[PDB]
Every structure is written in C-alpha cells, then in structure tokens.
Symmetry: C3
Subunit: 112 residues, 3 copies
C-alpha cells in the first residue's frame, strides 16, 4: 500500500517513526499485507484550510491495489485518527482519511 | 471533499485565503455539500514541467466521495481555472483540474 | 496525463530536466498522447519510510484520463523505474509506480 500523511503542523523524527510503526501494524494486522510493503510519505507544515480555519488539521490518503475488505476501512480510520491525535495533537474532527485503489502498481520494475 | 492545489509559484496568505473562499463557495453552490467539509491543501513553489517549460503552472486535484453531478465538473473547472488565473497569474492553458472519487472517507473517526 | 514524482533524496535541475524528458517520451511513445500535455510535479527530500527504513526511496504516481492500454503499464513501470535509478540512484526495490485514472480532467478551462 501507500499512505501519504499531510498535516498542517511540523513533524519531527519521533512523530514520523511512531506513525510509521502504526501504519506498518495496520498494514499487517488490518489489511493483511506485508508491513515492509507499505510506502509512507510525510508532508508536514502543509498550509491547509478546513472548517473555516488554518488550525491543526490532517489528511491521510491510503492507496491499496485490490481495495479493502468489508470491515477494514472502519478499522483503519479508527486507528489512524487516534494515532494522528496521539502523535500530533490534531483533534479527530480535523482529521480526514481517504481511501483509494490504484489500477496498477509497480515495484522492483514489475507490476503486481 | 478534498481540494489539493499545486502551483509552481509562491503562494502568500492572501492568495491562500482567497482560493479557500472560492473552494468553499464551489463546494456549497456547485457540489451541494457543506462548505466547512472541504479540506484544502496548498503546495506552492512546486517544481513543475509542462508544455516544454517550468513556467507558472497549476494542478488542482478535486476528490469527492460519491463523485459529481452531470454539470458539476464543467462548472468547477471554469471557476477554479478563473480563480487560479486571478490569484496566481497562471494562464488557463497552464492549469489542469483533475477529478477523483475516493472509495471511502473517514472524518471524526468514522466513515461516511 | 499527470506524473507526480516523490523521492526522499534531493533533486536538482539536471535530474528534474532528465526525468521530464523521460516522462515526455513515455507519454508520446508508450501512452500515445501529446508529450506537451503531461504535467509533471517533483517533490524532493520527502521524508519517507519503506521496508523498515528511511533510505532513498521513490513513489511515482501516474494519472491518465481513459486509463491505459494492455501493455502500457508494464512498459511505463520498466522505463520509469530505470530512469529513477539512473537519475537518483534509488534502487529498483525501493521504487513504486502507481497508476490511476481521473473521472474528469480540465485544461484551458474546459474538460476533455
């Protein structure tokens, strides 16, 4: 999978590593995929606007070839929202989690 | 919805706030959704290349759960293109507007 | 099309121009579309995590209205992976290439 984390607040090494461990665990335990194959990007201090303000806010984008099992997006949204609040202090009503599925995905020069 | 604005030029506070007001109004008046629920990200001074040059250029990505009504993408493209030209000075033939629909979207810890 | 290049390493002018020439050529020769209509964004020094480390890694996202012909994603993944390794030194098993298709795309104020 790919998880892209956009937050309006600064990240630091601790936050990035803690979120990476959450995302690895979600990939293994919820999505049932190898934790070494979630590619994670972090985009901090992003100028954002939501709900009338530029206050701390987050958008996490999840991409997984093949989509998601029936109960998986509800679980990922709960876990990711709690982790962003824990690590970044961003409140749950300023966190979006969006889910996509690419048509194709290449790794190591070949498509899955 | 989510609107991500990538421009190759610098943004400033005025431009970000003016574009946020356009995007809020488009969300309410064209997409028929609550203006407080469009999450906006701004990505300025992005190194870009298009049509043979690195000259001022923009890519706006629009994401909306449930997709779009028949006439809505034509209206959003017209409004967003005019607003980017107004605020950033980027010419219309250097503006792309792309439209997607996530499979799922979480807010406040639960999916819509 | 749109090609967004996220790498964890710094880009410089040479690398950006060389990758833009590859992407133009792929758009013309593999996707069969006008090379002046691929919009490219570059996102360097992106904090990333993959396969247990923050070591040099890349995620390239390809978006094309209308999707892809049967053999095109395999060819694009091979060419783009080789180019990122050539230009950035990032090894093939730390390169993802993801493929999407927007619902709609606007250029010059009107949708295709």
């Amino acid at each position: 999978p790919v998880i892209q984390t956009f937050v309006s607040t600064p990240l630091d090494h601790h936050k990035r590593e803690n979120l990476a461990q959450v995302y690895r665990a979600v990939t293994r335990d919820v999505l049932g995929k190898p934790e070494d194959l979630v590619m994670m990007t972090f985009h901090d201090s992003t100028p954002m606007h939501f709900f009338g303000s530029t206050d701390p806010v987050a958008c996490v984008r999840v991409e997984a070839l093949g989509g998601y099992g029936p109960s998986e997006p509800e679980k990922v949204t709960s876990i990711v929202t709690a982790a962003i609040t824990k690590e970044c202090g961003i409140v749950a009503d300023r966190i979006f989690v969006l889910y996509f599925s690419p048509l194709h995905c290449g790794w190591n020069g070949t498509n899955f």
